Amino acid sequence: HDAIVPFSEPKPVTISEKAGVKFKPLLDVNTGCAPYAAVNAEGETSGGLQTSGDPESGCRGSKYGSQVYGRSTWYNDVWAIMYAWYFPKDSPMLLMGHRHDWENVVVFINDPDEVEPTILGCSTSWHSGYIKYAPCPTDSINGSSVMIKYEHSFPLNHALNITKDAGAYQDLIMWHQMPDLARRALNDTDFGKAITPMNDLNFMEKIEAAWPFKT
Ligand SMILES: *[C@@H]1O[C@H](CO)[C@@H](O[C@@H]2O[C@H](CO)[C@@H](O[C@@H]3O[C@H](CO)[C@@H](O)[C@H](O)[C@@H]3O)[C@H](O)[C@H]2NC(C)=O)[C@H](O)[C@H]1NC(C)=O
Ligand SMILES: *[C@@H]1O[C@H](CO)[C@@H](O[C@@H]2O[C@H](CO)[C@@H](O[C@@H]3O[C@H](CO)[C@@H](O)[C@H](O)[C@@H]3O)[C@H](O)[C@H]2NC(C)=O)[C@H](O)[C@H]1NC(C)=O
Ligand SMILES: *[C@@H]1O[C@H](CO)[C@@H](O)[C@H](O)[C@H]1NC(C)=O
């Protein structure tokens, strides 16, 4: 329980690293787990938590701090950045819920190599699909940080959506900055009902599913 030590956020050097840090979302959590690190540098992964009668018990926050995962690519001449969070359980009241949970938002900007790139759209994970916004509404943008809420509405489990309430930042690690042992684990580990969204199997399919523009 709470054994995984997160990666530190390295000081950004490349275009994509700098943009990754610049456009980190704010995450506000409502009645669920705080985000936890899913994997460590040695490739061990979180065991999650069994479902129980309280949505937050055991997962109010790691003694090691939190993590947010990032991965980016050009797609259809727009720059797409995925931010993903891992939670040890998703266990709402009245619902069966499950061990493990992965959520993500995809932020779309015009070009990462501008002094002030423009957010063009944003898509928030919703039970394997997305809620798509084009444009990303201004009231949910805090500087260059989209404001995201993790919450549940009966009769479905937790999901993400934009919000006007400012949350908090987590230490960001980008896919390429994790050691090969960690990427191997994120590529291969079975999280049951939760699917790791930025690993090599799923990332491009997810970016395509997240495309919010009326093309
Ligand atoms: C995802 O988030 C969006 C953004 O907040 C949600 O859309 C919003 O839904 C509410 C419905 O409660 C709309 O609220 C307004 O509320 C008053 C209540 O008195 C109503 O009278 C107004 O006519 C108006 O509908 C709000 O306009 C709407 N915003 C947008 C941009 O659509 C959306 O429901 C969330 N989706 C999920 C699945 O949770
Ligand atoms: C998920 O990410 C991991 C880590 O980046 C990828 O595993 C790494 O990539 C290849 C897998 O084909 C391995 O290289 C191969 O090693 C064998 C045995 O030494 C050699 O015969 C081949 O010529 C090739 O060099 C690499 O060792 C492996 N690393 C680890 C730690 O597993 C994996 O490919 C990714 N999965 C997907 C679906 O992309
Ligand atoms: C923007 O985020 C900060 C925390 O990062 C918060 O203190 C502030 O109230 C937010 N402002 C708006 C307008 O959302």
Automatic annotation (TrEMBL):
The keyword Secreted applies. Disulfide bonds join C33-C59, C122-C136. It is found in: Secreted. It comes from the Eukaryota. Keywords: Secreted, Virulence. GO terms for cellular component: extracellular region. Belongs to the Necrosis inducing protein (NPP1) family. This is Nep1-like protein. It comes from Hyaloperonospora arabidopsidis (Peronospora arabidopsidis).
